[PDB]
Design a protein around this nucleic acid. Structure first.
Lengths: 140, 120, 38, 140, 190, 99, 70
RNA sequence: GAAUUGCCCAUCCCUUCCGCGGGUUUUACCCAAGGGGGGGCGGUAUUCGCUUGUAUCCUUCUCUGCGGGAUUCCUUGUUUUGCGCAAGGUGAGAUUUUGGGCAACAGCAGGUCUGUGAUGCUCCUCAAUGUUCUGGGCGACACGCGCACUACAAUGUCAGUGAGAACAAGAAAAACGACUCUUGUCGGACCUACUUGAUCAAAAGAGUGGGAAAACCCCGGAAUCACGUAGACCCACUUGGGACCGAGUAUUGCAAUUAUUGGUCGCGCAACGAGGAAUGUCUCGUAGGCGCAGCUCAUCAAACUGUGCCGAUUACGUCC
């Protein structure tokens, strides 16, 4: 039993491959979760899984391939694709009731879940550097 | 009794520090020369320079400084190389600085063109 | 370098993407298929 | 592949083969140690371990990334130009090790310039990292 | 289970906490997240900045003055240490000490220029709730940078010191002296 | 091997008349037609100072081209390819290839 | 006590042992805020005493660690 | 199939449901045994972005063209009916959807005659000043003089010298009538790969290999960042910063006269410690911080243009 979802935030896309387990501790890339070098980002990725059952619903084997932005945005993207995968699994193989329980509690707890946070970038324009602070003034 | 103590090495008092190479730079050298430190017979760091002729064996260091060509150690670290009136000179320190400079202080500063007059 | 649609060699030569149209400015000398929309 | 990032590759895959390799000699120690290892130093090459934080790691990179060498492998090299001429700092590398590190793999745990395992010795000998530290590890 | 309903920083508990003031209770909110690290949109509307705890707000306004400064993740590294320090010093949950310090370092009355005639005139002007919060935060964490600027040997510890002395009302703290001196003009002139 | 047809053009609505319409002739009629979705479209961006002198506000422009590369694939026509590439004549910079 | 000190001395180490358990919070900083030796090897000075249980380590980490009275 | 099958300091042991007997006077708490149920470490085992091997299948992740998607509903508020307003909601997204680009009329004695084969007249028209693959020089000079713009710092909120880890996006590129090839003609001035460049440096030499680019070796990587590996320095104008200054060498070129400069290694103990008055500009993925490419082109980017990364505080008001 499988589903495959994606995270998207900034220019990082994550790809969450779900393959049926009823145990497996969740991991990322080539480095699992206890060996993720930035402790802070590790903690972010934890709150995804930890909340809404620590290993009570989080029992699927979920590994990811995340590329396309710096370390921080990849960790964000990770959380998203994980929780997406759980939800979609509990949609197909299991009733809407269980999904509604899980989902509602995700939505509540400040990520939102649903949002890609799709605020990207600015263009550089004119005759001007970034958004305005110009060169610096001539007298007026 | 010691263990941060002044040191005469050009007959010039220079105070110790709790690191050997970093303090040694005041004697007319720099860190990148003092990768010779390993071969100067106290490669250890986090050591006083009041340790002269005790745990540093100062006389050893003072040979390396003067000629490192007696030792096997790479002579890519030499301060002067193939001077215009002599061969290589192994180091720049003390009065031996002034000697080379003076010869080319008259010649170099003659130069006329954009960058020439700036150097003059 | 040098230019082939003037002989001035000054008032700046474009050699980007193998074309000159800045010894005769491209705003005046268009129909190279370029457009500005953004 | 297998090596690096399965034991925490940053600091708990390094010290253990380091001890073992210095205790019984294996890798190159060729003169050139004193020379600049990383761009625009004002100091010596390092305080201690001039070319003994290097060798197994320089195998590891090429192992797991498959035949990154001499120009790609300095990809996971370093250089910031951390002192500079008062212009914007730029990346670099020093070629010195490239020669020596492509020599290396023909002995000890790798085979050739096409095949980068044998029994993958480093992995197997690193299975005792997790068990017990040799540094008084925090996490063990 | 055991991280579903339970909420920690990683050992610091939000059950203990109580809002110290009753003037403030909609601009001081409790944390549930395990790091104060931000990733959301934090402003879009006049009050949307008071939906979130003092912790997050503080850690973001902790330092500026970039040159290659590591911003948020770096700040969080100092947060951790400073919480442990405050804990063993007050012998009490560090979080609840922060709750107190933000309230008790804040100026609660002000006086402003608003007169005319070629001259200024001052009147007693009450500080609004969100302003008490914000102003307190900024002053405390301004103190920090100045303390380590060429001085002390301490890196996180100055933060812990300030937060302690602020909660005690002691005039060691950079925040406390401001509340004091401002109110000596704003309750001595109306 | 398998013959492919890449059509490179400045403009859309030249290439469109090639791919959609005139591949119908080769669709199962003489050879089999495997449609993918066309290759990424490059921009050639150039930046030109508006002012012909040093007094303005130092203004610039952004000029852009589209490069449409329309790829559709076939399964080994030989001698039939003559028909395929004689079909478009409808615009300049319509160029076609045979492997 | 005294302001400047590289030094390794009898006094240095003997003072150390008494002062370290006195405080409720021990960091490398505060021992050199007594100024007895520099912050530098004040670090090492605490480590190999904590190893022998004159102190309690708090953080699972070193450097920006802190300690307490054992 | 390589490889692992982690028992050398922890993942054969648990969870759920249930029944009985103990340690408890009671409560809290806890111990033992068995039944049912679920797999966990091996019935879920990894990852290789080439083992490019050997089998099978697909379009979630990609890509481009052409279409969907709200100023509607609701609060029954505000709205005298209207024009509309505010909050909340559905929702990817709340109003000029969002960011840019174009833009009326009247003009200025604005700038440009060194952009033009766009030009009035009248100057230069042959010891021509025009013009020159002509040579060399200037535009760049230095009483330490003022101003405009830029960049580096005075460090503990990369923090300074060391190491290792994970990880980014537009865009650039190629073709000489020069050789060879034939009845009508192919490869050399672009990059990057790989290996020698260490039985002994950097700079730098050369051979093999592919590309007209979604092919270029994974099309994309090393800075900001992460790190306690128990690194080093440690409250100093230093081990923080560079600017002057001398010696050597290689690279580029029609020609170098620090042109070279990604390099060695001196001087640093030369400045400067957040810097008077004054003054600049931005309300959100912005400011600030950081790096890369394009641009110009014998050669050099503190500049300019574009893409990406880390990413706030305050305000969301008034008109002084």
């Amino acid at each position: 039993k499988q589903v495959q979802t994606f995270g998207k935030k900034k220019t990082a896309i994550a790809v969450a491959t779900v393959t049926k387990a009823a145990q497996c501790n969740i991991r990322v890339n080539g480095v699992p979760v206890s060996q993720i070098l930035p402790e802070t980002l590790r903690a972010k990725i934890m709150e995804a899984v930890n909340v809404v059952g620590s290993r009570h619903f989080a029992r699927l084997r979920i590994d990811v391939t995340v590329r396309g932005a710096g370390q921080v945005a990849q960790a964000y993207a990770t959380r998203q694709a994980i929780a997406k995968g759980l939800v979609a699994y509990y949609q197909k193989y299991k009733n809407e009731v269980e999904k509604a329980a899980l989902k509602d509690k995700y939505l509540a707890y400040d990520k939102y879940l649903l949002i890609a946070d799709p605020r990207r970038c600015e263009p550089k324009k004119w005759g001007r550097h970034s958004a305005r602070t110009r060169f610096t003034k001539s007298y007026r | 009794e010691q263990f941060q103590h002044i040191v005469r090495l050009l007959n010039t008092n220079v105070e110790g520090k709790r690191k050997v190479p970093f303090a040694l730079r005041m004697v007319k050298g720099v860190g990148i020369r003092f990768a010779y430190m390993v071969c100067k017979k106290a490669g250890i760091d986090v050591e006083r320079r009041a340790g002269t002729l005790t745990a540093e064996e100062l006389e050893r260091i003072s040979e390396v400084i003067a000629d490192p060509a007696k030792f096997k150690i790479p002579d890519w670290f030499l301060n002067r190389q193939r001077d215009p009136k002599t061969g290589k000179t192994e180091h720049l320190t003390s009065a031996m600085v002034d000697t080379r400079l003076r010869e080319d202080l008259e010649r170099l500063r003659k130069n006329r063109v954009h960058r020439g007059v700036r150097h003059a | 370098r040098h230019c082939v649609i003037c002989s001035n060699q000054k008032a700046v030569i474009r050699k980007y993407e193998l074309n000159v149209c800045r010894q005769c400015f491209r705003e005046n000398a268009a129909n190279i298929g370029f457009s500005k929309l953004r | 592949i297998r090596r690096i990032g399965k034991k925490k590759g940053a600091t708990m895959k390094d010290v253990h083969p380091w001890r073992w390799v210095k205790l019984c000699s294996q890798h190159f120690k060729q003169e050139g140690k004193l020379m600049v290892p990383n761009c625009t130093e004002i100091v010596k090459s390092s305080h201690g371990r001039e070319r003994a934080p290097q060798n197994p790691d320089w195998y590891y990179i090429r192992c797991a990334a498959i035949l990154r060498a001499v120009y790609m492998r300095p990809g996971v090299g370093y250089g910031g130009l951390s002192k500079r001429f008062s212009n914007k700092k730029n990346r670099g590398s020093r070629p010195e090790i490239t020669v020596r590190a492509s020599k290396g793999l023909l002995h000890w745990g790798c085979k050739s310039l096409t095949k980068l395992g044998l029994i993958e010795k480093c992995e197997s000998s690193g299975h005792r990292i997790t068990k017990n530290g040799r540094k008084l590890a925090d996490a063990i | 289970m055991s991280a579903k309903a339970p909420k920690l920083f990683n050992k610091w508990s939000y059950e203990n906490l109580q809002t110290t003031e009753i003037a403030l209770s909609d601009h001081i909110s409790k944390t549930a997240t395990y790091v104060p690290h931000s990733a959301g949109r934090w402003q879009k509307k006049r009050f949307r900045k008071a939906r979130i705890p003092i912790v997050e707000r503080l850690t973001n306004g902790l330092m500026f003055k970039g040159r290659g400064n590591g911003k948020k993740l770096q700040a969080v590294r100092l947060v951790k240490h400073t919480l442990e320090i405050i804990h063993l010093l007050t012998d009490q949950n560090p979080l609840q000490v922060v709750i107190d310090a933000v309230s008790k370092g804040a100026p609660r009355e002000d006086s402003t220029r608003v007169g005319s005639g070629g001259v200024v005139r001052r009147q007693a002007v009450d500080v609004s709730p969100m302003r008490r919060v914000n102003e307190a935060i900024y002053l405390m964490c301004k103190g920090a940078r100045e303390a380590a600027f060429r001085n002390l040997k301490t890196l996180p510890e100055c933060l812990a010191d300030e937060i302690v002395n602020a909660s005690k009302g002691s005039s060691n703290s950079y925040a406390i002296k401001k509340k004091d001196e401002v109110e000596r003009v704003a309750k001595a002139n109306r | 091997q398998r013959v492919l047809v890449k059509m490179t053009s400045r403009n859309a609505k030249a290439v469109e008349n090639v791919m959609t319409e005139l591949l119908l002739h080769a669709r199962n009629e003489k050879v089999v037609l495997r449609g993918p979705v066309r290759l990424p479209t490059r921009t050639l961006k150039v930046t030109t100072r508006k002012t012909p002198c040093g007094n303005g506000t130092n203004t610039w422009d952004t000029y852009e081209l589209k490069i449409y590369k329309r790829l559709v694939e076939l399964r080994a026509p030989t001698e039939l390819v003559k028909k395929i590439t004689s079909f478009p004549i409808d615009a300049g910079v319509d160029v076609a290839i045979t492997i | 006590a005294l302001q400047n000190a590289v030094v390794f001395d009898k006094e240095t180490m003997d003072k150390l042992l008494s002062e370290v358990p006195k405080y409720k919070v021990i960091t490398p900083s505060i021992i050199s805020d007594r100024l007895k030796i520099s912050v530098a090897l004040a670090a090492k000075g605490l480590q190999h005493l904590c190893r022998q249980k004159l102190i309690k380590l708090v953080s699972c980490s070193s450097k920006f660690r802190l300690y307490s009275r054992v």
